[PDB]
């Protein structure tokens, strides 16, 4: 159990970085299902991590 709120902070910087990026890959008449499933993975990781570490 790594109790590191700064952990998700550094992670979420990288995560949100690529998340926003691949989120935009869904825009422009693009038929991509990969980025969206991926952003939800990233989304749920950063969310669940910081919640399990600080909200517990």
From Swiss-Prot:
Transmembrane annotation, as ranges: none
Post-translational modification: Tyrosine-phosphorylated upon stimulation of cells with EGF. May undergo proteolytic cleavage to give peptides which reassemble to form a transporter complex.
Top-level lineage group: Eukaryota
Cellular location(s): Cell membrane; Cytoplasm, Cytosol; Cytoplasm, Cytoskeleton, Spindle pole; Nucleus
Tissue: Expressed ubiquitously but at low levels. Shows a strong expression in the erythrocytes.
Binding site for ATP: 28-35
Extra remark beyond the main annotation: Originally designated as dinitrophenyl S-glutathione (DNP-SG) ATPase due to its ability to stimulate ATP hydrolysis in the presence of DNP-SG.
Biological function: Multifunctional protein that functions as a downstream effector of RALA and RALB. As a GTPase-activating protein/GAP can inactivate CDC42 and RAC1 by stimulating their GTPase activity. As part of the Ral signaling pathway, may also regulate ligand-dependent EGF and insulin receptors-mediated endocytosis. During mitosis, may act as a scaffold protein in the phosphorylation of EPSIN/EPN1 by the mitotic kinase cyclin B-CDK1, preventing endocytosis during that phase of the cell cycle. During mitosis, also controls mitochondrial fission as an effector of RALA.
Subunit description: Interacts with the GTP-bound form of RALA (via effector domain); during mitosis, recruits RALBP1 to the mitochondrion where it promotes DNM1L phosphorylation and mitochondrial fission. Interacts with DNM1L; mediates its mitotic kinase cyclin B-CDK1-mediated phosphorylation during mitosis to promote mitochondrial fission. Interacts with the mitotic kinase cyclin B-CDK1 during mitosis. Interacts with the GTP-bound form of RALB (via effector domain). Interacts with REPS1; the interaction is direct and does not affect RALA-binding nor GTPase activator activity of RALBP1.
Domain notes: The Rho-GAP domain mediates the GTPase activator activity toward CDC42.
Annotated protein name in UniProt: RalA-binding protein 1
Organism field: Homo sapiens
Complete-protein stretch covered: 393 to 446 of 655
């Amino acid at each position: 159990g790594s109790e590191t709120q700064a952990g998700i902070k550094e992670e979420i910087r990288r995560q949100e970085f690529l998340l926003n990026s691949l989120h935009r890959d869904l825009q422009g008449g693009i038929k991509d299902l990969s980025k969206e499933e991926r952003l939800w993975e990233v989304q749920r990781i950063l969310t669940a991590l910081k919640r399990k570490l600080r909200e517990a």
